[model samples]
Target: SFSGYLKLTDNVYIKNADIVEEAKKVKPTVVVNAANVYLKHGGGVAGALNKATNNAMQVESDDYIATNGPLKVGGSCVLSGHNLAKHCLHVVGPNVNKGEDIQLLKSAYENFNQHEVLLAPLLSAGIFGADPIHSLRVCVDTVRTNVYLAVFDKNLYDKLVSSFL
Candidate 1:
C-alpha cells in the first residue's frame, strides 16, 4: 500500500513505498539499512539492499567492520561496492528489547542524514523490532536530507491507516 506524502519543506517530503522500488527510483547516494551491530544484511531492508547490490552488501559490511570496528547501538558505518548507490550506510538501531532507546534511534537518523540522497526504512520495525508507528515518527521527525522512508511492511501500512482514520 502506498501511503501518501506529507511535505515538510519544498525540498523535504515523507512518503511510503516499497523499499526496493523506491531504491530503484531514487538510486540514493547513501542507502541506510536499519542494521545490527554485527553488520548482517540478510533480512528486511538490509536483505533487499543485499539483493539489489548483488551481494556486495555483506562483503562491504564485513570489510567495513574488519577495518573500522563493530557498530554499537547508535553507531554507523559506510560501505562501498554497491551498484545501486555510491555508498551504503549501516546504522545500529534499537532492538525489540530496546524500542524506547531514543538516543540510539536519533543517532541512526543523524548519522544517515549526512548524505544528500538517502533511502531509509522505518528503523527497528522489522526484525530488530519496534512499534512501526513510533519508528516511522522518529524517521520523519529526525531526517534532514532528501530521504525516502519506505514502509514496505503490510502491517505497518495497516497500522498507519488505522491510526490516521
Candidate 2:
C-alpha cells in the first residue's frame, strides 16, 4: 500500500483510505495482507563500497568493519562469517513479522550497548493507530532500562507516560 510510490523517498506519502475503509467492514472471514515490500535505508543511495563503509557507522564496539562491504545482495560474502557481527551484536533477520520484537531488542544492543544513549525515530506503528498507546506501552516495557521518548510536545509526553508508569 505505502510501498508503491515510495521508491526513493524516506518520507513517503501513504493513501491508506482504501485499505482502512475496507478493513472497517464487518467481515470475519476476510484476510488482508501486505507483502514483499522493500524498506529503504535512511541514508541516501551510494555505490557498494560506500554502502559497506557507511555501515560502519552502525557498527557496535564488538563488531568489526570488514575490509569490503556487501559484495552481493543479502550480504552473503563481503566479510563473511560471525567475526563481523557476533558476540556483542547478534545479527538476526530475514524472518517474518512475528520475530520483529526480539529482532528489535537485539538491534537495540547493536546501536547502544550498556550506557549508550540512543535516539529512536518513531514511525506510524508507534505513534498513530487505533491502539497507539498499546504499541508505545509494549516498546517501553521492552526497553527495560533508561529511555526518554523524544517529544516536541512535552505536555503530550507527560500525559502519556506519567499515568502508565
Candidate 3:
C-alpha cells in the first residue's frame, strides 16, 4: 500500500499506510478507533495500537469502560496517556459483515465530540468485517472536523485510493 495522503478536502484526507507512523507526524489531538464494546485491545487495529502506545491505551480504555459501563453500539469513550496523541477516542460499532449499519457508523464518528485533528483507522473494516471502502465513505461523510484515515491493510489501502482519490 502507498504510504501517503490523499487530500479529500482542505481539512480531510485518506491515508494509505501505517497508522502509528502517520500519527507521529500528524500529532493529532485524538486517535480514533472502531472499538469493541468490551474494550479489549487484543486484536486487529486495536492490537497494533495497544503495542504502539505501550499498553497505556489499554489501561485507560479498561478504566473508562469499567466506570461508565460497557460501551454500546453508537456509544463512545476516551482514553489518554499515549505518546501519539492527547486522547484515544473509541467508538463502538454495530455488529455484522454485509449491508452494514451506516447510521451506527455515523453515530460513532459523531460521538468523537471534539473539534481537533483526528487520526482514524478504517472503522469496522477489520475483525468486524465491514467493507473497507464503504466504511471510509461513511467516516468521511460524517466527521466535520479535520479527519485523517490510516488504512494499514494493503488491499484496503489500495482500494481506498483507487476508488476515492
Candidate 4:
C-alpha cells in the first residue's frame, strides 16, 4: 500500500548516480517566506555536554550548551569524511527510551536561526529507527523552502555495513 504524496524507497540516490558527485552538484532551493522551522537527526552526542563541546570543531547556537558535536557533521570538520555543511551544529536530543522529538524540532529552529546546519539523524527521527522516506521528504521540503539545512540519515549505517559486500 502507498502513502499520501510520499513514496517509499531504499535509497534516495538518483538512479545510477554517484552520491558524492550529486551532492556536489546539488543546487539548493530558495526560501520565500518566514514562519517556523523544524529539523532532526541522529548520531549526536546525547549527554556529556563537555564531550560534545570539546570535540566540536566549532559551535554556533542560541543556546550554547545545547549545540555541540562529535565532529560527525558540520562546520570545519568532516562528518563521515565529508565536508557537508558550511557549519555543523550537533544538538543533543534524547536517549533511546525517552528521545525528545520536540528537542530535535527546537534544535532545528535554533540551527536555522543561527545559520548552522541541522544534522538531524533521519530528519531528527533517530538512528536506524527513523523512516528513510520520511527523512527524505522533510529534507527536500526544508531545502525547497530556502532553509539552510541538510540531512544525514540512518541509511549511512546500511552503507557502512554494505561496504563489506
Alpha carbon lDDT of each predicted model: 0.70, 0.26, 0.74, 0.29
RMSD to truth, every model: 3.5, 17.0, 3.2, 11.8
Error of 4 at 143 (Å): 3.1
Residue pairs clashing, model 1: none
Q: How many steric clashes between backbone atoms does each model show?
A: 0, 0, 0, 12
Per-residue C-alpha lDDT of model 4 across residues 20-114, encoded as one tens digit per residue: 22223442121111111112221232222112334342233223324542322111112221233233334332232344353343333333334
Model 2: CA > 4 A from native? 1-37, 41-115, 122-130, 153-155
Tens digit of per-residue lDDT, candidate 2, span 1-165? 122211112221111222222222312121111111122222221111123334442342113334432221111111121121111111122222333332333333222223222222211222122132443454454434332233324454445445443
Q: Residues 65-94, candidate 3, lDDT per residue (tens digit)? A: 678878877777777728877777887766
Model 1 is weakest, by summed lDDT over 10 consecutive residues, at 1-10
Residue 68 lDDT (model 1): 77
Cα displacement (Å) at residue 92, model 2: 13
Query: Is candidate 2 or 4 superior in TM-score?
Result: 4
Considering lDDT, where higher is better, how would the candidates rank from best to worst?
3, 1, 4, 2
User: Global CA lDDT of candidate 1, please?
Assistant: 0.70
Query: How would you encode candidate 1's per-residue C-alpha lDDT over 1-165 as one tens digit per residue?
Result: 123645544334455577667766666677677778888888888888788878878887888778877888887877762676667788888786755475577777778677876767777777777777776666666776676566676666667646641
The stretch of ten residues in a row with the least summed lDDT in candidate 4 is 28-37
Query: What is the TM-score of each predicted model, taking all chains together?
Result: 0.81, 0.28, 0.85, 0.31
